[PDB]
Amino acid sequence: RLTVDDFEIGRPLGKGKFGNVYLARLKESHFIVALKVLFKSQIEKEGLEHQLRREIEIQAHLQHPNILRLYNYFHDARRVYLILEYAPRGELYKELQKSDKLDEQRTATIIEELADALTYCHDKKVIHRDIKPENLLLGFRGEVKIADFGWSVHTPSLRRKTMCGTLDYLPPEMIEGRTYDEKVDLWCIGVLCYELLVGYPPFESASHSETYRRILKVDVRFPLSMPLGARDLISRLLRYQPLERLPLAQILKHPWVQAHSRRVLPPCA
Amino acid sequence: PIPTWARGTPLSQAIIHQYYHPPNLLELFGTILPLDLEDIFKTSSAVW
């Protein structure tokens, strides 16, 4: 049914940084959305035809309050249009840049929310493979929205080999070229938790090469001011051996997460 | 020139409204149809 003409454009979002993304709303109902416009020529020129399909199928299959919703897509002769959830508080990375770091309560809340979303993802055999601050948007009450699915994969077998993600967040088993499973996501939750509380990622260095070596050695250095409960959580997630890592169900029950999380569920009905 | 609905207090109020009065998304947006790459342009990962 839906086409470009069923929407009124409000304003551009992100100043080109994220492509052609607009605040918009349905003309009839005034329901507010982010409309993302892709030029087919540009998709073909970058040979991203198959990545587009993948991203849409995965996003279509995921309905969770902490996962940015894809309502639908459509296309004309010249363009592909994604109808995405509008996240009105914007980018966590911006929020993080105000204070360069987050308090225990805001961090704990994000951790609980990611462990919940990723429980839902893994139960559907989706591995994200690129959890990090810059992939997260913020809802009306500050609730995390996993917003980028560029490296995501639907794998019933939970067996993959491809190098994916972002240097400071790469898990050791990927760097080692091993077969890996859903536990790559647990590693990234640990890196994220560290970065939100400290202001920088735990394996950061002047070169790609030195970062790789820090990761393989699990060279985590906690500042003295790091709260004790967060230190515990992070050390239990940043494990060399994937199966030794704290599982999502134990993340949710971790005393530090329990104590400091103030997670709210979006209304319904 | 940014439409009046898309900034200031009118956007805030509409955001508040939408958040606490969620609509029926199905009847608003319909089913998501399988992506046909041939029409758009010209493994285990599809077994859900």
Ligand SMILES: Cc1cc(Nc2cc(N3CCN(C)CC3)nc(Sc3ccc(NC(=O)C4CC4)cc3)n2)[nH]n1
């Ligand atoms: C897709 C999306 C984006 C949003 N919301 C926003 C909101 C936002 N704001 C700017 C800052 N004010 C204070 C709040 C609103 N700035 C951006 S700038 C921006 C634009 C796009 C993306 N991400 C993507 O387009 C990826 C997911 C496909 C991230 C940030 N995006 N809701 N849904």
